[PDB]
Design an enzyme around this catalytic site. Sequence first.
Site, short mmCIF file in Angstrom:
data_model
loop_
_atom_site.label_atom_id
_atom_site.label_comp_id
_atom_site.label_asym_id
_atom_site.label_seq_id
_atom_site.Cartn_x
_atom_site.Cartn_y
_atom_site.Cartn_z
N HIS A 1 -42.16 -31.12 43.00
CA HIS A 1 -43.31 -31.28 42.67
C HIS A 1 -43.31 -30.92 41.11
CE1 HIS A 1 -47.63 -29.95 42.16
NE2 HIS A 1 -47.66 -31.07 42.92
N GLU B 1 -41.21 -35.81 42.06
CA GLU B 1 -42.88 -36.26 42.15
C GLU B 1 -43.19 -36.07 40.70
OE1 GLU B 1 -45.61 -33.85 41.63
OE2 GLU B 1 -47.29 -35.20 42.11
N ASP C 1 -46.59 -36.93 37.47
CA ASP C 1 -47.90 -37.41 37.28
C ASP C 1 -47.66 -38.20 35.73
OD1 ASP C 1 -49.23 -35.33 39.43
OD2 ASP C 1 -48.08 -34.13 37.89
N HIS D 1 -49.63 -33.98 33.84
CA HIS D 1 -50.62 -33.58 35.01
C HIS D 1 -52.11 -33.87 34.36
CE1 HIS D 1 -53.27 -31.66 38.02
NE2 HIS D 1 -52.56 -31.98 38.84
N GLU E 1 -47.93 -40.48 40.58
CA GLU E 1 -49.55 -40.18 40.93
C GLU E 1 -50.08 -40.85 39.63
OE1 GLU E 1 -53.02 -36.82 41.65
OE2 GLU E 1 -50.76 -36.32 42.01
CA LIG Z 1 -49.17 -34.79 41.26
#
Ligand SMILES: [Ca+2]
Length: 301
Positions: free
Chosen positions: A14, A41, A43, A56, A143
Site C-alpha cells: 500500500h 499500489e 496514487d 496521495h 488509483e
Molecule cells: Ca491509494
Amino acid sequence: DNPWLDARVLNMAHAGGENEAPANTLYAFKRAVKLGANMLELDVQSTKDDQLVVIHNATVDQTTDGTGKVRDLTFEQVHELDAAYNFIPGRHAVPGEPPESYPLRGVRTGEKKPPPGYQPSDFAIPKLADVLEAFPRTPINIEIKGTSDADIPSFLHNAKLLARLLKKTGRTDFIVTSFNDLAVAKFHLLAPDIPIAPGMAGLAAYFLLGVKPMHGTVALQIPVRYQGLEIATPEFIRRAHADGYAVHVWFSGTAPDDEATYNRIIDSCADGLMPAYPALLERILDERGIERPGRPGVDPC
Ligand SMILES: [Ca+2]
C-alpha cells in the site's frame, strides 16, 4: 476465464508500505519488491505542467516540507521536496513533531547519508513514468486522485493523462481505479485494454443491491469495514468470486494493520491484501505457507 482469479495470495504494498517506508517513494517501492511484494499500489496526481506524479494527497503539506496543491506547482518545484520529511515508522506521515522522530528526513535534501543501495532521488515525489521504468516486470495498482471531492474535472483530467501514458507502455499488467466512477469510466473509454476496479457507486451497487459493476472490471477493491458495516466478509467474497471477480482488501483506518486482521482477511479467501506493513504480511504468509503466484503453497479455502 479471468486471470486475476488465479493471482493469489497477493502482497500488494500500500503506497509501497506507508508504515514501514515513506509512502509513494521510489525507496518504498524498491524496498517493497525486494521483500517479496507481488504488486505495487500507488496514487497519482498531476502537476501544473501535466506530469503524473505519485502522491496521495492533493497537497504536498503532509508528506513533504512544502505547501500548496500539486496541480498548482511545477514538476521541478515538487521533485525538489523531501518526500520523507515527515515519515515516522509505524505512523505514516505526521508533521510538527520533534525532529529526531524522522529517520529519513534530510536524505533527499542531501543533509543525511542515504541507506545502503539508494540515492537521494529515491526519496522524492517520482513521476509515474519513472516508476514504470523502474518496475517493467512488476504489476502496478494505480488509483486516480483529484484535488477535491467537488472538483470532478481534476479526476477526469488525470484519467485522460493516465490512459495516454499507460497506452504508450503497451503493458496490460495494471489495475486502474479511483474513488470517482466517472473517472474510471473515462479511463476505460480511452484505454479499453487495461483492467479496472470500480468506484464507490459501482462498489455500493454491487454490494448493497447486486448490480454487477462496469464491464472490464476484473477485481473489487474494498475496505474491511465502512461506516459501521463489515465489507470484507466471507459471504461477500464468496459471491464476488462466484461472479468471476477477484477481491483485494485494503485497510487505511477502516480496520487495524494487525497480524490478527491480516489473518482474518486471508481466511476470508481474499485474493490480495494491501498492507501498510508489507514486510509483516510477508512474514505471515511465509510462516503459514500460503500459496503465492508461481509458488507452491496451501489455499486457505
Ligand atoms: Ca491509494
